[PDB]
């Protein structure tokens, strides 16, 4: 591939200089490097709670109190998740429910004053950021700016 991303052997990037036949080949390989809810969403789906349940069971009763104690607190959450109710991939947000409208009114006050549930200024926060994101992805994407936004976005969702 041309001169950005190409994995040949253990070395993984390939620049091209058509001057002399020169295939510059840089050496670092497919390194899944992620940050943000993106990365945790992945980790969260991959886990088979059953395994960690059994693994902690052993960790719980066998080693000394230091690492087994941590494991008993860590088995609590894993148990309920599995026990009865719903599964853990949901703690990650990708679809934000919006509170009803008349609950976040827009009203005529006096002369023309208007009152709105503060929730609406936050909502706009999220939407603008979310959109600006999409447009920043499409426009073209310089890394610093994409994350920068994704940070803002995150905060907003909070």
């Amino acid at each position: 591939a041309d001169g950005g991303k190409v994995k040949s052997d253990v070395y993984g990037r390939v620049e091209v200089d058509l001057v002399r036949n020169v295939v510059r080949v840089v050496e670092s390989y497919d390194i899944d490097a992620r940050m943000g809810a993106e990365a945790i969403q992945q980790l969260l789906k991959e886990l088979d709670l059953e395994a960690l349940e059994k693994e902690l069971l052993e960790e719980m009763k066998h080693p000394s109190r230091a690492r087994r104690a941590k494991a008993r607190k860590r088995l609590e959450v894993v148990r309920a998740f599995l026990d009865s109710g719903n599964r853990p991939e949901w703690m990650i947000l990708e679809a934000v429910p919006v509170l009803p409208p008349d609950l976040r009114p827009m009203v005529q006050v006096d002369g023309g004053r208007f009152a709105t549930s503060d929730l609406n200024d936050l909502y706009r926060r999220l939407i603008n950021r979310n959109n600006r994101l999409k447009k920043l992805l499409a426009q073209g994407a310089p890394e610093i700016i994409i994350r920068n936004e994704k940070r803002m976005l995150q905060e907003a969702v909070d």
């Binding site: 050496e27 670092s28 390989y29 990365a39 947000l93 679809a95 409208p101 979310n130 995150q154």
Partner: protein
């Protein structure tokens, strides 16, 4: 509005359960306007702070990460956690669940070292560098010879 639609194609109770052909409005009073919900579709996910920042990070607990600090680290800012695999080394094997910095991560994806030292005058270092630059593999510490000492202290080619 009460039982009426927005444009008004249908306006009373006889057809209370149907929606308007050209525009969408099924009606009972504006209470439906205060109980219904909409959702925003987030670009790249973000997480619920209700689960991330409660004392026991329910995702930190479940996902064996730094329960309180590894999260904050990758979540809001750019500190990457190698998710599935990453063959190349830091000095040791791929860190299955460990997190790294921009700096070192940078050193990974493009190549070990970035050194752009560009010479002061037109004849002194332009010659030292040129003679040894194009096809000559330059070893670490290659002592270019003119402005001060142009020091190339790293790997393979130039």
């Amino acid at each position: 509005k009460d039982y009426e639609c927005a444009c008004g194609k249908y306006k009373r109770q006889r057809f209370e359960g149907k929606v308007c052909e050209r525009c969408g409005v099924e009606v009972t009073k504006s209470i439906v306007r205060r109980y219904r919900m909409g959702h925003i579709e987030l670009a790249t996910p973000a997480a619920h702070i209700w689960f991330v920042k409660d004392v026991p990070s329910k995702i930190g607990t479940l996902l064996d990460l730094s329960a309180t600090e590894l999260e904050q680290v990758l979540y809001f800012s750019k500190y990457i956690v190698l998710d599935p695999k990453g063959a190349i080394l830091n000095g040791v094997p791929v860190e299955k669940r460990q997190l790294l910095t921009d700096e070192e991560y940078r050193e990974l994806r493009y190549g070990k070292q970035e050194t752009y030292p560009l010479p002061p005058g037109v004849d002194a270092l332009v010659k030292d560098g040129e003679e040894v630059v194009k096809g000559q593999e330059l070893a670490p510490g290659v002592v270019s010879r003119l402005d001060g000492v142009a020091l190339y202290r790293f790997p393979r080619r130039v």
